[PDB]
Coordinates of C-alpha atoms in Angstrom, one line a residue:
Chain A
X1164 CA 0.0 0.0 0.0
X1165 CA 0.9 3.7 -0.5
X1166 CA -0.2 4.4 3.0
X1167 CA 1.7 6.5 5.5
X1168 CA -0.1 4.8 8.4
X1169 CA 0.8 1.3 7.1
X1170 CA 4.5 2.4 6.4
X1171 CA 4.9 3.8 10.0
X1172 CA 3.4 0.6 11.5
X1173 CA 5.7 -1.7 9.5
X1174 CA 8.8 0.4 10.4
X1175 CA 8.0 0.4 14.1
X1176 CA 7.5 -3.4 14.0
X1177 CA 10.7 -4.0 12.1
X1178 CA 12.6 -1.7 14.5
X1179 CA 11.2 -3.5 17.5
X1180 CA 12.5 -6.9 16.3
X1181 CA 15.9 -5.3 15.5
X1182 CA 16.1 -3.6 18.9
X1183 CA 15.3 -6.8 20.7
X1184 CA 17.8 -8.7 18.7
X1185 CA 20.6 -6.2 19.5
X1186 CA 19.7 -6.4 23.2
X1187 CA 20.3 -10.1 23.2
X1188 CA 23.8 -9.6 21.7
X1189 CA 24.8 -6.8 23.9
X1190 CA 28.6 -6.4 23.7
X1191 CA 28.8 -9.6 21.5
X1192 CA 13.8 -3.0 0.9
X1193 CA 11.9 -1.0 3.5
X1194 CA 14.0 -2.2 6.4
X1195 CA 17.6 -1.1 5.5
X1196 CA 17.2 2.7 5.9
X1197 CA 15.4 2.7 9.3
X1198 CA 17.8 0.0 10.5
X1199 CA 20.8 2.2 9.6
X1200 CA 19.3 5.1 11.3
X1201 CA 18.6 3.0 14.4
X1202 CA 22.1 1.5 14.5
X1203 CA 23.9 4.8 14.0
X1204 CA 21.5 6.4 16.5
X1205 CA 22.3 3.8 19.2
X1206 CA 26.1 3.9 18.6
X1207 CA 26.2 7.7 18.8
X1208 CA 23.7 8.1 21.6
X1209 CA 25.9 6.0 23.8
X1210 CA 28.9 8.1 22.9
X1211 CA 27.0 11.3 23.8
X1212 CA 25.9 9.9 27.2
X1213 CA 22.2 9.4 26.3
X1214 CA 20.4 6.7 28.2
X1215 CA 17.9 6.1 25.4
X1216 CA 17.1 7.2 21.9
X1217 CA 15.5 10.6 21.7
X1218 CA 12.1 11.2 20.0
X1219 CA 14.2 12.9 17.2
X1220 CA 16.1 9.7 16.5
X1221 CA 12.9 7.6 16.4
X1222 CA 11.1 9.9 14.1
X1223 CA 14.2 10.3 11.9
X1224 CA 13.9 6.6 11.0
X1225 CA 10.3 7.1 9.9
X1226 CA 11.2 10.3 8.0
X1227 CA 13.9 8.6 6.0
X1228 CA 11.9 5.6 4.9
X1229 CA 8.9 7.8 4.0
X1230 CA 11.2 9.8 1.7
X1231 CA 12.5 6.6 0.2
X1232 CA 9.1 5.1 -0.3
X1233 CA 7.5 8.3 -1.7
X1234 CA 10.5 8.5 -4.1
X1235 CA 9.7 5.1 -5.5
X1236 CA 6.0 5.9 -5.8
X1237 CA 6.6 9.1 -7.7
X1238 CA 9.4 7.6 -9.9
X1239 CA 6.9 4.9 -10.9
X1240 CA 4.4 7.4 -12.4
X1241 CA 3.7 6.8 -16.1
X1242 CA 4.9 9.1 -18.9
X1243 CA 1.7 10.0 -20.8
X1244 CA 3.4 12.5 -23.2
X1245 CA 2.3 12.5 -26.8
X1246 CA -1.1 10.9 -26.4
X1247 CA -3.8 13.1 -28.1
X1248 CA -6.7 11.2 -26.5
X1249 CA -7.4 8.8 -23.7
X1250 CA -5.0 10.1 -21.1
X1251 CA -7.7 10.2 -18.5
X1252 CA -8.3 6.6 -19.4
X1253 CA -4.7 5.4 -19.0
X1254 CA -4.5 7.3 -15.7
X1255 CA -7.6 5.5 -14.5
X1256 CA -6.2 2.2 -15.6
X1257 CA -3.0 2.7 -13.7
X1258 CA -4.2 4.7 -10.7
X1259 CA -2.0 7.7 -11.5
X1260 CA -3.9 10.2 -9.4
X1261 CA -3.7 7.9 -6.4
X1262 CA 0.0 7.5 -6.8
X1263 CA 0.7 11.2 -7.2
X1264 CA -1.5 12.1 -4.1
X1265 CA 0.0 9.3 -2.0
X1266 CA 3.5 10.3 -2.9
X1267 CA 2.8 14.0 -2.3
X1268 CA 1.2 13.3 1.1
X1269 CA 4.1 11.0 2.2
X1270 CA 6.7 13.6 1.2
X1271 CA 4.7 16.3 3.0
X1272 CA 4.2 14.3 6.1
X1273 CA 7.9 13.5 6.2
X1274 CA 8.9 17.2 5.9
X1275 CA 6.3 18.2 8.5
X1276 CA 7.8 15.6 10.9
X1277 CA 11.3 16.9 10.2
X1278 CA 10.4 20.5 10.6
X1279 CA 8.8 19.7 14.0
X1280 CA 12.1 18.2 15.1
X1281 CA 13.4 21.8 14.9
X1282 CA 17.0 21.0 13.8
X1283 CA 17.6 23.3 10.9
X1284 CA 20.9 21.6 9.8
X1285 CA 19.0 18.3 9.3
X1286 CA 16.2 20.1 7.4
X1287 CA 18.7 21.7 5.1
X1288 CA 20.5 18.4 4.5
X1289 CA 17.3 16.4 3.8
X1290 CA 15.7 19.0 1.6
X1291 CA 18.8 19.0 -0.5
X1292 CA 18.5 15.2 -0.9
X1293 CA 15.0 15.5 -2.2
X1294 CA 15.8 18.3 -4.7
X1295 CA 18.8 16.3 -6.0
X1296 CA 16.6 13.2 -6.4
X1297 CA 13.8 14.9 -8.3
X1298 CA 16.3 16.9 -10.5
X1299 CA 18.3 13.7 -11.1
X1300 CA 15.3 11.7 -12.0
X1301 CA 14.1 14.3 -14.5
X1302 CA 17.4 14.0 -16.4
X1303 CA 17.6 10.2 -16.3
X1304 CA 15.8 9.5 -19.6
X1305 CA 18.3 11.7 -21.4
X1306 CA 21.2 9.6 -20.3
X1307 CA 20.0 6.2 -21.5
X1308 CA 22.2 4.5 -24.1
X1309 CA 24.9 7.1 -23.6
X1310 CA 28.3 5.3 -23.7
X1311 CA 30.1 8.6 -23.0
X1312 CA 29.2 8.2 -19.3
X1313 CA 32.2 8.1 -17.1
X1314 CA 32.7 6.2 -13.9
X1315 CA 32.7 9.4 -11.8
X1316 CA 29.5 10.5 -13.5
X1317 CA 27.9 7.1 -12.7
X1318 CA 28.9 7.3 -9.0
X1319 CA 27.5 10.8 -8.8
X1320 CA 24.2 9.6 -10.4
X1321 CA 24.2 6.8 -7.9
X1322 CA 24.8 9.3 -5.1
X1323 CA 21.8 11.4 -5.9
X1324 CA 19.8 8.3 -6.6
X1325 CA 20.6 6.2 -3.5
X1326 CA 23.6 7.0 -1.5
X1327 CA 22.8 10.7 -0.7
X1328 CA 19.7 9.8 1.3
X1329 CA 21.5 7.1 3.2
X1330 CA 24.4 9.5 4.0
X1331 CA 22.1 12.3 5.1
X1332 CA 20.3 9.8 7.4
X1333 CA 23.4 8.6 9.2
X1334 CA 24.8 12.1 9.6
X1335 CA 21.4 13.2 11.0
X1336 CA 21.3 10.4 13.4
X1337 CA 24.6 11.5 14.8
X1338 CA 23.5 15.2 14.8
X1339 CA 20.5 14.3 16.9
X1340 CA 22.8 12.5 19.3
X1341 CA 24.9 15.7 19.7
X1342 CA 28.3 14.1 19.1
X1343 CA 31.1 16.2 17.6
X1344 CA 31.1 17.5 14.1
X1345 CA 34.0 15.2 13.3
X1346 CA 31.9 12.1 14.2
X1347 CA 28.9 13.4 12.3
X1348 CA 31.1 13.7 9.2
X1349 CA 32.4 10.2 9.6
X1350 CA 28.8 8.8 9.9
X1351 CA 28.0 10.8 6.8
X1352 CA 30.9 9.0 5.0
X1353 CA 29.8 5.7 6.4
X1354 CA 26.3 6.2 4.9
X1355 CA 27.6 7.6 1.6
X1356 CA 30.0 4.8 1.0
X1357 CA 27.7 2.0 2.1
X1358 CA 25.1 3.5 -0.2
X1359 CA 27.5 3.4 -3.2
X1360 CA 28.6 -0.1 -2.3
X1361 CA 25.0 -1.1 -2.1
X1362 CA 24.1 0.4 -5.5
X1363 CA 27.2 -1.0 -7.3
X1364 CA 26.3 -4.5 -5.9
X1365 CA 22.7 -4.0 -7.0
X1366 CA 24.0 -3.1 -10.5
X1367 CA 26.3 -6.1 -10.6
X1368 CA 23.4 -8.4 -9.5
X1369 CA 21.1 -7.0 -12.2
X1370 CA 23.7 -7.8 -14.8
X1371 CA 24.6 -11.3 -13.7
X1372 CA 21.0 -12.4 -13.1
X1373 CA 20.2 -11.0 -16.5
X1374 CA 22.9 -13.2 -18.1
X1375 CA 21.4 -16.4 -16.7
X1376 CA 17.6 -16.1 -17.1
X1377 CA 16.2 -18.2 -19.9
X1378 CA 14.1 -15.5 -21.7
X1379 CA 15.4 -12.4 -23.4
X1380 CA 16.7 -10.1 -20.6
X1381 CA 14.4 -7.4 -21.8
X1382 CA 14.0 -5.6 -18.4
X1383 CA 17.6 -5.4 -17.4
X1384 CA 19.5 -2.2 -16.9
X1385 CA 21.7 -2.8 -20.0
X1386 CA 18.6 -3.5 -22.2
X1387 CA 16.9 -0.2 -21.3
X1388 CA 20.2 1.7 -21.8
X1389 CA 20.9 2.3 -18.1
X1390 CA 24.7 1.7 -18.2
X1391 CA 26.2 0.7 -14.8
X1392 CA 29.6 -0.1 -13.4
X1393 CA 30.2 -3.5 -15.1
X1394 CA 29.2 -2.0 -18.5
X1395 CA 31.2 1.2 -18.1
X1396 CA 34.3 -0.7 -17.2
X1397 CA 33.7 -3.0 -20.2
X1398 CA 33.3 0.0 -22.6
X1399 CA 36.9 0.9 -21.9
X1400 CA 37.9 -2.3 -23.6
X1401 CA 35.1 -3.3 -26.0
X1402 CA 34.6 -1.2 -29.2
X1403 CA 31.9 -3.5 -30.5
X1404 CA 30.0 -3.3 -27.2
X1405 CA 29.8 0.5 -27.7
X1406 CA 28.5 0.2 -31.3
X1407 CA 25.9 -2.3 -30.2
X1408 CA 24.6 -0.1 -27.4
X1409 CA 24.5 3.0 -29.6
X1410 CA 22.3 0.8 -31.9
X1411 CA 19.9 0.3 -29.0
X1412 CA 20.4 -3.4 -29.7
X1413 CA 18.7 -3.0 -33.0
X1414 CA 20.0 -6.2 -34.5
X1415 CA 18.4 -9.5 -33.5
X1416 CA 20.3 -11.1 -30.6
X1417 CA 22.7 -8.2 -30.2
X1418 CA 21.6 -7.8 -26.6
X1419 CA 22.9 -11.3 -25.9
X1420 CA 26.2 -10.4 -27.6
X1421 CA 26.5 -7.3 -25.5
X1422 CA 26.0 -9.3 -22.4
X1423 CA 28.7 -11.8 -23.3
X1424 CA 31.1 -9.0 -24.2
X1425 CA 30.6 -7.5 -20.8
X1426 CA 31.2 -10.9 -19.1
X1427 CA 34.2 -11.3 -21.4
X1428 CA 35.8 -8.0 -20.4
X1429 CA 36.4 -8.5 -16.7
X1430 CA 34.4 -5.4 -16.0
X1431 CA 32.3 -7.4 -13.6
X1432 CA 35.4 -8.1 -11.6
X1433 CA 36.4 -4.4 -11.7
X1434 CA 32.9 -3.6 -10.4
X1435 CA 33.3 -6.1 -7.6
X1436 CA 36.5 -4.2 -6.7
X1437 CA 34.8 -0.9 -6.8
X1438 CA 32.0 -2.1 -4.5
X1439 CA 34.6 -3.6 -2.2
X1440 CA 36.6 -0.4 -2.2
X1441 CA 33.6 1.7 -1.2
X1442 CA 32.7 -0.8 1.5
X1443 CA 36.2 -0.6 3.0
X1444 CA 35.8 3.2 3.1
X1445 CA 32.5 2.7 4.9
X1446 CA 34.1 0.3 7.5
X1447 CA 37.0 2.7 8.1
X1448 CA 34.4 5.4 8.7
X1449 CA 33.2 3.5 11.8
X1450 CA 36.4 3.4 13.6
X1451 CA 35.8 6.7 15.3
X1452 CA 33.2 4.8 17.3
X1453 CA 34.1 2.5 20.3
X1454 CA 33.5 -1.2 20.1
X1455 CA 29.8 -2.0 20.5
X1456 CA 27.2 -4.4 19.1
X1457 CA 26.0 -1.5 17.0
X1458 CA 29.3 -0.8 15.4
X1459 CA 29.8 -4.5 14.7
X1460 CA 26.4 -4.6 13.0
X1461 CA 27.2 -1.5 10.9
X1462 CA 30.4 -3.2 9.8
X1463 CA 28.5 -6.4 9.0
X1464 CA 26.0 -4.6 6.8
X1465 CA 28.9 -3.8 4.5
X1466 CA 30.2 -7.4 4.5
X1467 CA 26.8 -8.9 4.0
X1468 CA 26.1 -6.6 1.1
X1469 CA 29.4 -7.6 -0.5
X1470 CA 28.7 -11.3 0.1
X1471 CA 25.6 -10.9 -2.1
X1472 CA 27.8 -11.3 -5.1
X1473 CA 30.5 -13.5 -3.5
Chain B
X67 CA -9.4 48.5 -10.7
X68 CA -6.1 47.8 -12.4
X69 CA -3.7 45.2 -10.8
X70 CA -0.8 47.6 -11.4
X71 CA -2.6 50.6 -9.7
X72 CA -3.4 48.3 -6.7
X73 CA 0.2 47.1 -6.3
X74 CA 2.1 50.3 -7.2
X75 CA 3.2 50.9 -3.6
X76 CA 5.2 47.6 -3.7
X77 CA 5.9 47.8 -7.5
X78 CA 9.7 47.9 -6.9
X79 CA 9.6 44.9 -4.6
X80 CA 7.7 42.9 -7.2
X81 CA 10.0 43.9 -10.1
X82 CA 13.0 42.6 -8.1
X83 CA 11.2 39.4 -7.3
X84 CA 10.2 38.8 -11.0
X85 CA 13.9 39.2 -12.1
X86 CA 15.0 36.7 -9.5
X87 CA 12.4 34.0 -10.0
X88 CA 14.1 32.3 -13.0
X89 CA 17.4 31.7 -11.2
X90 CA 15.8 30.1 -8.1
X91 CA 15.1 26.8 -9.8
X92 CA 18.8 26.7 -10.9
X93 CA 20.7 26.7 -14.2
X94 CA 21.7 23.0 -14.5
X95 CA 18.6 21.0 -15.5
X96 CA 17.5 22.4 -18.8
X97 CA 14.1 20.6 -18.7
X98 CA 13.5 21.7 -15.2
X99 CA 14.6 25.3 -16.1
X100 CA 12.2 25.2 -19.1
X101 CA 9.3 23.8 -17.1
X102 CA 9.8 26.5 -14.5
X103 CA 9.7 29.4 -17.0
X104 CA 6.6 27.9 -18.5
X105 CA 4.7 28.8 -15.3
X106 CA 6.7 31.8 -14.1
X107 CA 6.3 33.4 -17.5
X108 CA 2.6 32.7 -18.0
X109 CA 1.4 35.9 -16.5
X110 CA 0.3 35.3 -13.0
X111 CA -0.9 38.2 -10.9
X112 CA 1.8 37.6 -8.2
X113 CA -0.8 38.6 -5.5
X114 CA 0.8 36.3 -3.0
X115 CA 4.3 38.0 -3.0
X116 CA 2.5 41.4 -3.1
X117 CA 0.7 40.4 0.1
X118 CA 4.0 39.4 1.6
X119 CA 5.6 42.7 0.8
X120 CA 2.7 44.8 2.1
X121 CA 2.5 42.9 5.4
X122 CA 6.3 42.9 5.6
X123 CA 6.5 46.7 5.3
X124 CA 3.4 47.4 7.5
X125 CA 4.8 45.3 10.4
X126 CA 8.4 46.3 9.9
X127 CA 7.5 50.0 10.4
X128 CA 5.3 49.1 13.5
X129 CA 8.4 47.3 14.9
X130 CA 10.9 50.1 14.3
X131 CA 12.8 48.4 11.5
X132 CA 14.8 50.6 9.0
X133 CA 14.2 48.7 5.8
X134 CA 12.9 45.3 4.7
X135 CA 15.1 42.4 5.7
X136 CA 16.5 39.9 3.2
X137 CA 14.3 37.3 5.0
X138 CA 11.2 39.3 4.0
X139 CA 12.4 39.4 0.4
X140 CA 13.3 35.7 0.2
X141 CA 10.0 34.8 1.9
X142 CA 8.1 36.5 -0.9
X143 CA 9.9 34.4 -3.6
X144 CA 9.4 31.2 -1.6
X145 CA 5.7 31.8 -1.3
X146 CA 5.3 32.2 -5.1
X147 CA 7.4 29.1 -5.7
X148 CA 5.2 27.0 -3.4
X149 CA 2.2 28.4 -5.1
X150 CA 3.7 27.5 -8.4
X151 CA 4.5 23.9 -7.3
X152 CA 1.0 23.4 -6.1
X153 CA -0.4 24.6 -9.5
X154 CA 1.8 22.1 -11.3
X155 CA 0.5 19.2 -9.2
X156 CA -3.1 20.5 -9.5
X157 CA -2.8 20.5 -13.3
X158 CA -1.6 16.9 -13.2
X159 CA -4.5 15.8 -10.9
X160 CA -7.1 17.8 -12.8
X161 CA -5.6 16.6 -16.1
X162 CA -5.9 20.2 -17.3
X163 CA -4.2 20.8 -20.6
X164 CA -4.0 24.6 -20.5
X165 CA -3.1 27.3 -17.9
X166 CA -3.1 30.9 -19.1
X167 CA -3.2 30.2 -22.8
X168 CA 0.0 28.0 -22.6
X169 CA 0.3 24.2 -22.3
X170 CA 0.8 22.7 -18.8
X171 CA 4.0 21.1 -17.7
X172 CA 2.6 17.6 -17.9
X173 CA 1.3 18.2 -21.5
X174 CA 4.8 19.2 -22.6
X175 CA 6.8 16.6 -20.6
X176 CA 4.4 13.9 -19.4
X177 CA 2.9 13.3 -16.0
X178 CA 6.1 11.9 -14.4
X179 CA 8.3 14.9 -15.2
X180 CA 5.6 17.3 -14.1
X181 CA 5.3 15.5 -10.8
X182 CA 9.0 15.5 -10.3
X183 CA 9.2 19.2 -11.1
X184 CA 6.6 19.9 -8.4
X185 CA 8.5 17.7 -6.0
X186 CA 11.6 19.7 -6.7
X187 CA 9.9 23.0 -6.2
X188 CA 8.4 22.0 -2.9
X189 CA 11.8 20.8 -1.7
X190 CA 13.6 23.8 -3.1
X191 CA 11.1 26.0 -1.2
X192 CA 11.7 24.2 2.1
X193 CA 15.5 24.4 1.5
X194 CA 15.5 28.1 0.9
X195 CA 13.2 28.6 3.9
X196 CA 15.4 26.6 6.2
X197 CA 18.3 28.9 5.1
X198 CA 16.3 31.8 6.6
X199 CA 16.9 30.1 10.0
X200 CA 13.5 30.8 11.6
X201 CA 12.1 27.6 12.9
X202 CA 8.6 29.0 13.6
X203 CA 8.2 29.9 9.9
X204 CA 9.7 26.6 8.9
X205 CA 7.1 24.7 10.8
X206 CA 4.2 26.9 9.6
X207 CA 5.1 26.4 5.9
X208 CA 5.7 22.7 6.3
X209 CA 2.1 22.5 7.6
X210 CA 1.0 24.4 4.5
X211 CA 2.6 21.9 2.1
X212 CA 1.0 19.0 4.0
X213 CA -2.3 20.9 3.8
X214 CA -2.0 21.0 0.0
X215 CA -1.7 17.2 -0.1
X216 CA -4.5 16.7 2.4
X217 CA -6.7 19.0 0.3
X218 CA -5.8 17.2 -3.0
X219 CA -6.7 13.9 -1.5
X220 CA -10.0 15.1 0.0
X221 CA -10.8 16.8 -3.4
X222 CA -10.2 13.6 -5.3
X223 CA -12.2 11.5 -2.8
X224 CA -15.3 13.7 -3.2
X225 CA -15.6 14.3 -6.9
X226 CA -19.3 14.6 -8.1
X227 CA -20.4 14.2 -4.4
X228 CA -23.5 16.4 -4.0
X229 CA -23.7 15.7 -0.3
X230 CA -20.6 18.0 0.2
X231 CA -21.3 20.7 2.9
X232 CA -20.3 24.3 2.7
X233 CA -18.1 23.7 5.7
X234 CA -16.1 21.0 3.8
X235 CA -15.9 23.3 0.8
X236 CA -14.4 26.1 2.9
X237 CA -11.9 23.5 4.5
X238 CA -10.9 22.4 1.0
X239 CA -10.6 26.0 0.0
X240 CA -8.3 26.6 3.0
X241 CA -6.2 23.6 2.1
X242 CA -6.0 24.6 -1.6
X243 CA -5.5 28.4 -1.3
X244 CA -6.0 30.2 2.0
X245 CA -3.6 28.1 4.2
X246 CA -0.6 29.3 2.1
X247 CA -1.8 32.9 2.2
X248 CA -2.5 32.9 5.9
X249 CA 0.9 31.4 6.6
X250 CA 2.6 33.9 4.3
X251 CA 1.2 36.9 6.0
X252 CA 1.9 35.5 9.5
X253 CA 5.4 34.7 8.4
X254 CA 5.9 38.3 7.1
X255 CA 4.9 39.6 10.6
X256 CA 7.2 37.1 12.3
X257 CA 10.2 38.3 10.3
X258 CA 9.3 41.8 11.4
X259 CA 9.4 40.8 15.1
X260 CA 6.0 42.2 16.0
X261 CA 3.9 40.7 18.7
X262 CA 2.3 37.3 18.8
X263 CA -1.1 39.1 18.9
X264 CA -0.4 41.0 15.6
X265 CA 1.1 37.9 14.1
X266 CA -2.1 36.0 14.7
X267 CA -4.2 38.9 13.3
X268 CA -2.1 38.8 10.2
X269 CA -2.7 35.0 9.9
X270 CA -6.4 35.7 10.0
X271 CA -6.2 38.5 7.4
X272 CA -4.5 36.1 5.1
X273 CA -6.9 33.2 5.8
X274 CA -10.0 35.2 5.2
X275 CA -8.7 37.1 2.2
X276 CA -7.5 33.7 0.7
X277 CA -11.0 32.2 1.2
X278 CA -12.6 35.3 -0.4
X279 CA -10.1 35.0 -3.2
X280 CA -11.0 31.4 -3.8
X281 CA -14.8 31.9 -3.6
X282 CA -14.6 34.7 -6.2
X283 CA -12.4 32.4 -8.4
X284 CA -15.0 29.7 -8.2
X285 CA -17.7 32.2 -9.1
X286 CA -15.7 33.4 -12.1
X287 CA -15.5 29.9 -13.5
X288 CA -19.3 30.3 -14.2
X289 CA -19.7 34.0 -14.9
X290 CA -16.8 34.9 -17.3
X291 CA -16.5 34.0 -21.0
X292 CA -15.0 30.8 -22.3
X293 CA -11.7 32.4 -23.3
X294 CA -11.7 35.2 -20.7
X295 CA -10.9 32.0 -18.7
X296 CA -9.4 30.0 -21.5
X297 CA -11.3 27.0 -20.1
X298 CA -15.0 26.8 -21.0
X299 CA -17.4 28.1 -18.3
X300 CA -18.2 25.6 -15.6
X301 CA -14.9 23.7 -16.0
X302 CA -14.7 22.9 -12.2
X303 CA -18.3 21.6 -12.2
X304 CA -17.7 19.5 -15.3
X305 CA -14.8 17.7 -13.6
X306 CA -16.9 17.2 -10.4
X307 CA -15.4 19.9 -8.3
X308 CA -18.5 21.3 -6.7
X309 CA -17.9 24.9 -5.5
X310 CA -19.9 27.4 -3.5
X311 CA -22.3 28.4 -6.3
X312 CA -23.1 24.8 -7.0
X313 CA -23.5 24.0 -3.3
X314 CA -26.0 26.8 -2.8
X315 CA -27.7 25.9 -6.1
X316 CA -28.2 22.3 -5.0
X317 CA -30.4 23.6 -2.2
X318 CA -33.0 25.0 -4.7
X319 CA -32.4 23.0 -7.9
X320 CA -32.4 19.2 -7.0
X321 CA -32.1 18.2 -10.7
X322 CA -28.5 19.5 -10.4
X323 CA -27.9 16.4 -8.2
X324 CA -29.2 14.0 -11.0
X325 CA -27.0 15.7 -13.6
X326 CA -23.9 15.8 -11.4
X327 CA -24.3 12.1 -10.3
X328 CA -24.5 11.2 -13.9
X329 CA -21.1 12.8 -14.4
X330 CA -22.8 14.7 -17.3
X331 CA -23.1 11.4 -19.2
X332 CA -25.6 13.0 -21.5
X333 CA -25.3 15.6 -24.2
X334 CA -25.7 19.2 -23.1
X335 CA -26.4 18.1 -19.5
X336 CA -23.5 20.4 -18.5
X337 CA -25.1 23.3 -20.2
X338 CA -28.3 22.3 -18.4
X339 CA -26.6 22.3 -15.1
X340 CA -24.9 25.7 -15.6
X341 CA -28.3 27.2 -16.4
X342 CA -29.6 25.7 -13.2
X343 CA -26.8 27.3 -11.2
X344 CA -27.7 30.7 -12.8
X345 CA -31.4 30.1 -12.2
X346 CA -30.8 29.5 -8.5
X347 CA -29.7 32.1 -5.9
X348 CA -26.4 30.4 -6.0
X349 CA -24.0 32.9 -7.6
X350 CA -25.4 35.7 -5.5
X351 CA -25.1 33.7 -2.3
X352 CA -21.5 32.7 -3.2
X353 CA -20.8 36.5 -3.6
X354 CA -22.1 37.4 -0.2
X355 CA -20.0 34.5 1.2
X356 CA -16.9 36.1 -0.3
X357 CA -17.9 39.5 1.0
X358 CA -18.4 38.1 4.5
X359 CA -14.9 36.6 4.5
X360 CA -13.5 39.8 3.0
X361 CA -15.0 41.8 5.9
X362 CA -13.4 39.6 8.5
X363 CA -10.1 40.2 6.6
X364 CA -10.5 44.0 6.9
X365 CA -11.3 43.6 10.6
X366 CA -8.0 41.7 11.2
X367 CA -6.0 44.7 9.8
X368 CA -7.3 47.1 12.5
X369 CA -4.5 46.2 14.8
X370 CA -2.1 47.9 12.4
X371 CA -1.4 51.7 12.3
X372 CA -2.9 53.6 9.4
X373 CA -0.4 53.5 6.6
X374 CA -0.4 53.2 2.8
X375 CA 0.4 49.6 3.3
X376 CA -2.6 48.9 5.4
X377 CA -4.8 50.9 3.0
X378 CA -3.6 48.6 0.1
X379 CA -4.2 45.5 2.2
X380 CA -7.8 46.7 2.6
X381 CA -8.1 47.6 -1.1
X382 CA -7.0 44.1 -2.0
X383 CA -10.3 42.9 -0.4
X384 CA -12.4 45.4 -2.3
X385 CA -10.4 44.7 -5.6
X386 CA -11.2 41.0 -5.2
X387 CA -14.9 41.4 -4.7
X388 CA -15.2 43.8 -7.7
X389 CA -13.0 41.5 -9.8
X390 CA -13.7 40.4 -13.4
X391 CA -10.2 38.8 -13.7

């Protein structure tokens, strides 16, 4: 459902099971983003001398996931441009008005929650994430099938898409704990580099799953012209790959060829390394924190993400 | 009564604002830039920034301030940006194809891009406002943006519903229009540092003027010609948005209910309905509803000293009720 009330219920239930788990190990996706907020909140709260999470920490986890979920809802809206007739019909058929209103309300409820936490630094940080998301998503169609994309441009795109919200959420959790600016910056870098690692791994998985399904991989990133880390690395070595993409896989079975050129090029292995390198930056970001079950879980999130392609 | 003659006492403030509006979306996303100019250049009256300047100057003088603060000036720009973002989403939801002779953002670029553009402008507005560092105003405006979404959901959930009460119509009208105006005039007083009591009076001026604005707009959808609006007369009615003239008309012309329930499934039934609205006392009763809100607006200005700014704030009420637009 597109429901704020359902979202908040599921986040509180997921956070309860996570909290109770972490209590049992003391000193030993809709869930990732609130979990990261909760873990960073707990680690930094203990450093600041707080005896429990503040109301600001608890609402932050709901604010972040509401932004994430509203983003998906709005990104999913159909492009009706060009139709001379029957737009009201296609919007009825796909529930466009409901998606727009649900996304609008969820964004607004999130921003209203955040404003009422009264930390202007966090409001600035999160507002910027939303602007960059919307602006980035407007330009995304114009970058499909463009082999002139660089690796730095891909990482920036993945930042605005994914990593920026996660980095803003871990910095904000530290800000609400009142730890030093230096520690808030490190939590920001944890979130940013975990987010990039997470996105590169998701891009690797989309490719390697694509290359094993039995039908034509028609809905893969590569097929739609969304060129990710394995492909970009491959394009450095594969002149026929580039020509094939520029053709939008016009020729019968060219998509299959493109996929095998990518697997050929070792760019998958170089994408592995890139995701591993961002992960190790994320882990290094946590060492300003003392040993705790919360730091060990934040470190393990990186390793468990990387094991997804191991 | 000309819009220019009405606003001349803040003409210089408005000209600065109009020069700056373009750059406030940025220079880096050409589609986003182009979609912004499409609304900013379409010829809006800029009444909302004018109200911010008038209240800003009236309350600044009462407080002892020398000139208008940069916060006053940025507030005015933010209010017009929020207004613009809400028009963009309202066009998507209404599936309107035209706004002031020009095509709407979603017609040019598709529903998804129009929604994202509005998302950007709401976020850009909040971000600019946060950089004014006043948390009271930040919380006020974040409530306004939620109110827009609450209003849009209520509006879409009650299309063609002839059991709508006048109280629900005024609530919807607050969510759609008057909430933003009430918050903009309260925020202008806040940035001048005047008393809580005067701040609250300014909120109520903006609320009641906004409600009077929207009632008159809903009247004009019936009473003005089909290209004096661009849209044909009764466009709100035809899409099932029942406004004050229709609500009053329904009390005397029960066939209106049959036509509206049918969603005008039958040829010339919309023409029939519009004649029923005119036949009833409806348009006249909606006009006195607007006047009654306008009078409460003028009462809320009496806590200000006499000043050319107060006089123009009162004239805005009279201009609206005389309006042909």
